[PDB]
Amino acid sequence: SMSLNIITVTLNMEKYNFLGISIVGQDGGIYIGSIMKGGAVAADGRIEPGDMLLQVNDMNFENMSNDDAVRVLRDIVGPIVLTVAKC
């Protein structure tokens, strides 16, 4: 079968300074507020504004404070595997 609303997106940051997304926290509680020009995410094209960020390289964002999720994502930015939920 095919995963419909949970999708895996691989990004290679060797070519990009930044992800080019604004991440907001409101669990599914972290999501994409905007996608910016010139970043790894826009280049890939699969992630959309409003998608929820579930996982980055087997780190799950649930039970994570806001500072903690930034520090984690910061350190990670090898290939980056993002798991996002469309709904």
Residue numbers in the entry: 260 to 285, 291 to 341, 345 to 354
From the paper:
The central event in Wnt-PCP pathway is the activation of Weak-similarity guanine nucleotide exchange factor (WGEF) by the adapter protein Dishevelled (Dvl). Dvl2PDZ binds to both C-terminal as well as the non-canonical internal peptides.
Additionally, the apo structure of human Dvl2PDZ shows conformational dynamics different from its IPM peptide bound state, suggesting an induced fit mechanism for the Dvl2PDZ-peptide interaction. A comparison of available Dvl2PDZ structures shows deviations with RMSD values in the range of 1.7–2 Å. Importantly, significant conformational variations are observed in the α2 helix and β2–β3 loop, which are part of the peptide binding pocket. This conformational variation is more prominent in the structures of human Dvl2PDZ, bound with different peptides. Additionally, variations in Sector 1 composition highlight peptide-dependent conformational adaptation of Dvl2PDZ domain. Thus, our structural and MD simulation studies suggest that Dvl2PDZ adopts peptide-dependent conformational change due to its intrinsic flexibility. In short, we can infer that Dvl2PDZ may not have a preformed binding pocket, rather it modulates the binding pocket based on the substrate available for binding.
